[model samples]
Target: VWKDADTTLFCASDAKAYETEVHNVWATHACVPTDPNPQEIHLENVTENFNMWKNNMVEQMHEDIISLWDQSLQPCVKLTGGSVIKQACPKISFDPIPIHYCTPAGYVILKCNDKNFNGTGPCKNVSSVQCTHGIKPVVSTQLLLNGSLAEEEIIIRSENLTNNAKTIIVHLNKSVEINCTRPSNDIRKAYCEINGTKWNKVLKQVTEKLKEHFNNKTIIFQPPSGGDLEITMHSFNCRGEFFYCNTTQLFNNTCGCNGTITLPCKIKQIINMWQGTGQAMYAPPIDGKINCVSNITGILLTRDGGANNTSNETFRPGGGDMRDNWRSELYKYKVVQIE
Candidate 1:
């Protein structure tokens, strides 16, 4: 074993025979940590498509597949301007050649398989090479939402670097700028691609359908405040049920009740009655209720009335006298999910 800091060689023979045996017995291996999956990647030259291109053009001349570790000793030759790829090996590149190297997003560490090559030392030369995103441009949509004045906002982003390291910088148009504005009072309601326009059309159609079917009901569509939305498929049936209560029977035995009855007393009427100067002093109940009928199967009561009681059972109010005055009320409504 010929061990050194720069290079290590494992030979089957002594040091004298290592001159020839090292090429055969002492096998060389390279480990590129950046490129876990090392594969050939094609590069571009210019728009003309007539001339030569490839980042490491000189190394391509080598008969064997030249890896990034091999190129550490000597990289591709470049012009004085540091732009055009200078031709060092004329024998190569007469035909199309696939460059077998890795172009990482940032700095790339060109490493070799020191463990396999010599069992002790790193590659002959470890290099920290620079890479670029190439000439191609990448565009992305940053924001898509509804804006004020019936307008929509759609933001786009374009950057040379990518989230992925292996991805090749793609070819994009010269103009990264995009004008996605809605035409004033036109059919364009939003600018979230063609899908947003289609959504607007469906929105109007559904609104019209609701207006036609439910004459007394008001239809107002409220979009999601945030972008999170979910849709679920559920099967349900709607059936009408009749509910009736005789006015005399409903208020029977209730406090301050005579022969007359009124359903859903207005808030203003109750407020004025409570402050009235009358002998019978039938001030409005501390709490009042409203009742309405609809062609629905069931009613939903969505609140707890336990907290509204004024009984002195909790030592909170005018004992049992306040209990009759602060009777809790209930409002009824049907609930349904809209598509």
Candidate 2:
């Protein structure tokens, strides 16, 4: 804003009305007061304080916007950080999911490309995630001291970051443990219990999100030592994870060790039963991992309170028949035909 540096205006007069008019114009027009045709800028607010025939009381009325002493405010620039990179597909089955890390903590949202995040797959090394909070999200780094390899943790600050800003390349780290605060009461997973029997110890999938329809829903094992089984359902923020399970008696001695067993009756309805690779498995210590693949294949019937057997043998779930509740597990059904 340095236009012809220090342009000035003056009214070296005695009339109170004339000097006051120029002062009013300077303020009303937002005129960048330049250093006047004088040797110094003090004359820009020139006023003759005569202390007119009384005890001089200079009670702070000599204020003016000294435009000649202008300063260039540091401009706000676009955030610059780690560039998006394409990565190799994962080889290990149990390797924790990939997550991109950022420094200078308060920033949680990552704006990728020119648009919002699309519900996509892991073709590249990315999740397009929106991170509000989780475990160790605010990570700081320190160089290795001597040769021991132990690093330090620095609690990040916002003001100190602005001093060295233009966000540097955000690094990546293998997140070990993650626990987010329950966003709401509705999404909290119900503790799974079947026929008054709760399975306390079971093998389960890495699951999260409702509509995701994650593969590997759930199934517990019968310990070789004769202890019962329990299902594990975590509201994990991980990939291909979960099941909305309400269990029942899950016993499988496999006909005196002769093979095969019926799948669990706790099941839900999906829109298009023909597509998607969602699955569940039951693992016993003796046998191999038993695959429970029949959950979403056919029509489902829980209980019909009305006993309306006179209707057609099949039914469809949509076009105003289903909503938030029916979307999860619709009850009072007679061998379903829902979408």
| Highest-lDDT candidate | 1
Total clashing pairs in model 1: 0
lDDT of 2 by residue, 11-50 (tens): 1212122233333333334322221332211222222111
Tens-digit lDDT track for model 1 on 299-319?
111111232233211100011
Clashing pairs in 1: none
TM-score, every prediction: 0.12, 0.14
| CA-lDDT, candidates in order | 0.18, 0.17
Candidate 2, residue 164: the lDDT equals 25
For model 2 the TM-score comes to: 0.14
lDDT of candidate 1 at residue 147, scale 0 to 100 = 10
- Candidate 2: segments with Cα more than 4 A from true spot: 1-92, 98-130, 134-339
